[PDB]
């Protein structure tokens, strides 16, 4: 055949004015002379502006443009879990052909109202600060914001790793498919990263969609959408999928770029405007769905890595307006050594309670406050030096909690454990301790509660809540054990 | 291994034409041999080095006591 | 008439019509189009090509695909059944509850009432929220802007208002959720249902829901605006009705406009905009009000990006407004809820006359003190519980209480807060703050006024705060 | 410490079979494909499939 | 207004917006082919070099664009109510753009009621029909000898590169 | 195939080859251009016209002139005979020891090696600098990118680094002078001559120079990066080597790209950039790394435009960086050397475990201390001192020592320093600051930690004073 074939009307720069194919379906994935796909994104009447998917040095002009005649699909499956692919589903891991050889349109629309359901599942990350201060739900789309490797990713890692146990738990409500859409994260970055997940083999329920820095832009752009169909799939199949889009920031960069090369605009900040829309449509596809959809979820953890905390920054403003909070991670703290380095004032979950255990809620509620207040006397009068004696204690309390909300570099947890140390501080047994040693207290304390109070924990774990047993034991434990920790 | 019979006649017999000889499997190919020798030593360098056709038996130790 | 899609360059769909070219705005029905892909003629581009806007998304449109012009703008199911129902832009449901079979269809253009249809001087709609009424003594059937981001429970706030008032309310409501998260609409859905403010036994629950979410392409979002609009005009004019028109969020409509301006051949203006931003709102905004045919109380949640307002768009908005809510994040951040930007949440209709002086003046004192207080505040943000004088301390402290008195908890987001909210009828309030102005008792801590009902409750809370 | 050993030997032969497979593929293809073209009947097969286009394109 | 006509060819825009005018203007009255074979003779009595620059001189100065074919080929009866549109083209500076109007017009003007293809590994399969792949089987009835492996070749490529492409 | 010069707008050479259009990237040699005028095809514009780039002079280019396609993309000799040679971009000398002749040529545009032979992890290289090693423990074979202002002692530093390292090196080194000054290369030349590790009894020197100077047209500057890569990938992978690849300065490359963008008819992105800027990054950067096939320790001088880093170009760069080396002009201004902004300079392997977390931790206290101390600076800036808090007063002083302690004069550039510079191995470093953490000096003259290597000597430097 060569009749719904076309000749490359002009090419250079991977911007193919495409002669022919004049019956072309909009957004048809097209098929190359170079084999390759392209997208007939632009139907101009006299050409098809074809975004060339991948390298074009190969390419030359008048070259035959073939329909693929397909609007893009991506292979879909759970056989993406334990696979590093590029978005077309190409093993770059060298793990060979994916079990995911079902395919699914990468665009599949976002849920209905009734189809959706609100969240009320928690979820967690193994990070005290997180689960406490940003208790996690399921079916999300909420902003992760922070700058790069610091183990920026650590944050995510401990979460993914944290889901391991949950994947060692059951339900899609413990078990979780993690989807790491890596947008523009170099081969190295990934190389390393993947290397980690694998090591944690939290990878097992986990897709790593790997779009490294090298990759062509639409591809990278696409990578999430690719993921998107797959995660909705999981969602609709009851599966609760977690996508970490790290990051759309880069995605935009590509997307505009692509646009520009198509001469398709550079809106505010050089990005054309429906990149919001881009994502909106993308992200609405992340939801916690009702049971007709298996109840599943696609929890979206979009990531934006900020340049200098630039957030009124278009895409960030945009994103903010979709997201239901942002989790700001704070650098100064980092330098202080405080990793996680948060500013939780600038981390918000409007959501709050749908996202958590009672256990935590009970100890944390107050804690948030105790720090808040602590901060406040650092702040009204922008001095860490005090304004009232009461608070000279309270500040101690705050300070203690400060030691506690940290999270070890390369370390997740689970909720009862988390609560364990938290209760200890919240209900205070360690302001009768120096703040640096609090964490130290935990090492022992934790290894103790793990040892002993796995029983007790058995209860807390059971209740999702601190119970009378647990508590009663706790009050006692903490005091006694603490007493043992010290003396 | 795969299909089309006239083309594959050209190739599938050529799968095994290579295998249908085994001292230089209709070509081991001197280049294949050379780069093989390169990568096989270089691989060895990239590996751990304690000979791969020998058993690493045990060792013994004695820890700090005061 | 007939066209072929000759070029699809995004959702600006250029359809070249044989001859057969109808007016701008005209709804075209794309044929062979999997769904009703209504194209609104945007331009007669010249040579019987129109630039049209898809309100749907393109996905596989064959080059040439056939369009048979629907020949007039979008006429859509309207009528009362849209009440208690979620309609999409195209007047069809998205409640997914059968059809919203009307009688009346409407082109979702409509226009600005005449001068004579204007009612010249408006009358307060009260909210029973101290801060709200006080600073913004809202007007029945006016244009209310809520500038506001999200975060604070932006939506929560509006909702909460809706909850207190739109429930209480005598008339109808129209809700157009523009560029709004389907999910929240989902929760909300279930809620409205829950509340019976969507009764599912009433398609006149009290409210027609119009949703034109963010996952919609602009064409849908833009036009959902008209949709909601057309509908409320039905209830006011046709149904007499005191309609409440809830918009979340008009910005996103507008934004949808700005986002489009480029493809639309309109220059990204200042800030990128549609340079037609002003009419886009304006003529439109003019379509919603209190005439002598009733009231459309037009409640606009307004994203103002990063809540900047010096950005023209809000600047314009004010012109249309009659009540402005700029909610101040600072206040929110102070945990103060009402988290309003109080001295930027007004309703112009404030007077010792109109709002009574009691109020008014109290406000003038208040606005003033806050202005002043702030000044001293300027010392404290870095300079605390004494860089300064102590009469001044009183006022300062008074402010700290007052502040807490500004805080009225939420009667819905008690779920997160634990705080039941209160709704505080006006007299108890005015008098309340007026007592604070009288500086009642103060050995007290200053949270005594925090998140209570009227001032008594602060007292109630006070005794209680003394354990 | 033992195993890395064994594993190398395998991994070598696996890599060696691929570097045969590539050298095979290139050489095998580069040998036995040049001569083929003496078939005018690869274009009678072009012809054949083309009658199964010209026919089997209905 | 006018009325859109297009007998195959057919460009739309950039001379193709133009060709589609005289396309309805010549096809109305049906002086179309009378003006084709007109415009064909003129395609080369124009294009020349006794003039490289004396029937397509645009400028050395303007005077040519006042009239030089409003007056030198309105010096010809050739083009006698389609020589008005060449006079437009002469003034309106597009006088070097005519080769694609006439190519559009004649690959228009033959193939003006005709169909050209070219499948895989043929290349002169480039004709003027009203039905297809009954006709291109008639090109395999030139002789099926000579075709679908040369001119443009199943040798490296279709067939030959496809078994390389699996890898 | 031949082309006609159809349009010359500078070294953006619009060529129409009507003799078919060979690849985008097909390298062209211009006919009528005796002096080898390479154009690389950039676009198939259509019309059998390509936009090509001359990298070079556009003398006597009659529009029509024949250009002859080189029939491949740009290929260059690569071979050991390049070391000790200053090769230009074009594979030719600028060693001017006759042609840099090699066995094999390589097309210089190439693939970014696949993930799996890429070693996924790496190990901190030691630079012999306290400040570095401690604070931003960069990795062998990593891409370390030296952000640094204009001539900010960076150039000095890199040379010093060469000095510290290249010597010691087991594999070899490459210097790719991208937009380097002819002068610096000179300087370097002599330094190298001098060093004699550009030994000329070696065209197999310890270091190969590839230079693509400023005076070249951008296309050349643009391309020197690929060129160099190609050689080095050859030494690393092919010659096994641990290559140290000194690139000074990729920015200038970037710039060369950007510079063309406009008159690549493109929208040159923000500030003029490239929309493809990123892909540009991938496309070189992803090619350079550490495989199992050796290490390319990739030293990128990165001019930080206007020391603007928020500047998307650098903004991107960090991502690519195994080691991000941020030189603090601010510090530099304090005359300080090591002049770093180390609270900006990182190594991902700066993360406890990896590097010996003590080592790190000792750093964490410092990093903190300084940072808090940094925090204070607005307050202090007005307020100075006397209503603050004591502990801070201590830190201030301590920080002040620490600050000084990072400082180390230049060993090479005694010509610059006057001083003899210093070199510090780990222990004195770890300890050094740690000692300061112990505040053992808090009655010892604070500035005395300035321009020192070992803390011992610094202690000494306090002492002679008292």
Swiss-Prot record, chain B:
Signal peptide coordinates: none
Span covered, complete protein: 36 to 101 of 108
Protein known as: ATP synthase peripheral stalk subunit F6, mitochondrial
GO aspect biological process, one term: proton motive force-driven ATP synthesis
Cellular component, GO, one term: mitochondrial inner membrane
GO molecular function: proton transmembrane transporter activity
Modified residues (N6-acetyllysine): 6, 11, 44, 49, 64
Provenance organism: Bos taurus (Bovine)
Quaternary organization: Component of the ATP synthase complex composed at least of ATP5F1A/subunit alpha, ATP5F1B/subunit beta, ATP5MC1/subunit c (homooctomer), MT-ATP6/subunit a, MT-ATP8/subunit 8, ATP5ME/subunit e, ATP5MF/subunit f, ATP5MG/subunit g, ATP5MK/subunit k, ATP5MJ/subunit j, ATP5F1C/subunit gamma, ATP5F1D/subunit delta, ATP5F1E/subunit epsilon, ATP5PF/subunit F6, ATP5PB/subunit b, ATP5PD/subunit d, ATP5PO/subunit OSCP.
Entry's localization field: Mitochondrion; Mitochondrion inner membrane
N6-succinyllysine: residues carrying this PTM: 49, 64
Similarity comment: family membership: Belongs to the eukaryotic ATPase subunit F6 family.
Domain of life of the source: Eukaryota
Predominant place of localization: mitochondrion
Key words of the record: Acetylation, CF(0), Hydrogen ion transport, Ion transport, Membrane, Mitochondrion, Mitochondrion inner membrane, Phosphoprotein, Transit peptide, Transport
Curated annotation (Swiss-Prot), chain D:
Keyword Ion transport: yes
Alphabetical keyword list: Acetylation, CF(0), Hydrogen ion transport, Ion transport, Membrane, Mitochondrion, Mitochondrion inner membrane, Transit peptide, Transport
Example GO biological process: proton motive force-driven ATP synthesis
GO cellular component: mitochondrial inner membrane; mitochondrion; proton-transporting ATP synthase complex
An MF annotation (GO) of this entry: proton transmembrane transporter activity
Disulfide bonds: none
Highest taxon, organism lineage: Eukaryota
Predominant location: mitochondrion
Residues bearing the modification N6-acetyllysine: 30, 42, 53
Repeat is among the record's keywords: no
Compartments, record wording: Mitochondrion; Mitochondrion inner membrane
Function field: Subunit b, of the mitochondrial membrane ATP synthase complex (F(1)F(0) ATP synthase or Complex V) that produces ATP from ADP in the presence of a proton gradient across the membrane which is generated by electron transport complexes of the respiratory chain. ATP synthase complex consist of a soluble F(1) head domain - the catalytic core - and a membrane F(1) domain - the membrane proton channel. These two domains are linked by a central stalk rotating inside the F(1) region and a stationary peripheral stalk.
Family according to the record: Belongs to the eukaryotic ATPase B chain family.
Name of the molecule in the record: ATP synthase peripheral stalk subunit b, mitochondrial
Curated annotation (Swiss-Prot), chain E:
Major localization class: mitochondrion
Gene Ontology MF terms in the entry: proton-transporting ATP synthase activity, rotational mechanism
GO BP, one annotated term: proton motive force-driven mitochondrial ATP synthesis
GO CC terms of this entry: mitochondrial inner membrane; mitochondrion; proton-transporting ATP synthase complex
Disulfide bonds: none
Record keyword Transferase present: no
Superkingdom of this protein's organism: Eukaryota
PTM notes: Acetylation at Lys-139 decreases ATP production. Deacetylated by SIRT3. In response to mitochondrial stress, the precursor protein is ubiquitinated by the SIFI complex in the cytoplasm before mitochondrial import, leading to its degradation. Within the SIFI complex, UBR4 initiates ubiquitin chain that are further elongated or branched by KCMF1.
Compartments it resides in: Mitochondrion; Mitochondrion inner membrane
Protein keywords: Acetylation, ATP synthesis, Hydrogen ion transport, Ion transport, Membrane, Mitochondrion, Mitochondrion inner membrane, Transit peptide, Transport, Ubl conjugation
Subunit: Component of the ATP synthase complex composed at least of ATP5F1A/subunit alpha, ATP5F1B/subunit beta, ATP5MC1/subunit c (homooctomer), MT-ATP6/subunit a, MT-ATP8/subunit 8, ATP5ME/subunit e, ATP5MF/subunit f, ATP5MG/subunit g, ATP5MK/subunit k, ATP5MJ/subunit j, ATP5F1C/subunit gamma, ATP5F1D/subunit delta, ATP5F1E/subunit epsilon, ATP5PF/subunit F6, ATP5PB/subunit b, ATP5PD/subunit d, ATP5PO/subunit OSCP.
Family: Belongs to the ATPase delta chain family.
Native species: Bos taurus
UniProtKB/Swiss-Prot annotation, chain F:
Annotated positions binding phosphate: 151-155
Record key words, sorted: Acetylation, ATP synthesis, ATP-binding, CF(1), Glycoprotein, Hydrogen ion transport, Ion transport, Magnesium, Membrane, Metal-binding, Mitochondrion, Mitochondrion inner membrane, Nucleotide-binding, Phosphoprotein, Transit peptide, Translocase, Transport
Any one GO molecular-function label of the UniProt entry: ATP hydrolysis activity
Record-listed ATP binding positions: 151, 153-156, 181
Residues engaged in binding ADP: 151-156
EC numbers for this chain: 7.1.2.2
GO biological process: proton motive force-driven ATP synthesis; proton motive force-driven mitochondrial ATP synthesis
Cellular-component GO terms for this entry: mitochondrial inner membrane; mitochondrion; proton-transporting ATP synthase complex
PTM sites of type N6-succinyllysine: 66, 103, 201, 206, 464
Modified residues (Phosphothreonine): 254
Modified residues (Phosphoserine): 357, 375
Residues recorded with modification N6-acetyllysine: 66, 103, 140, 201, 206, 368, 422, 427, 464
Principal subcellular localisation of the protein: mitochondrion
HAMAP family given in the database record: ATP_synth_beta_bact (MF_01347)
Similarity comment text for this entry: Belongs to the ATPase alpha/beta chains family.
Task performed by this protein: Catalytic subunit beta, of the mitochondrial membrane ATP synthase complex (F(1)F(0) ATP synthase or Complex V) that produces ATP from ADP in the presence of a proton gradient across the membrane which is generated by electron transport complexes of the respiratory chain. ATP synthase complex consist of a soluble F(1) head domain - the catalytic core - and a membrane F(1) domain - the membrane proton channel. These two domains are linked by a central stalk rotating inside the F(1) region and a stationary peripheral stalk.
Organism: Bos taurus (Bovine)
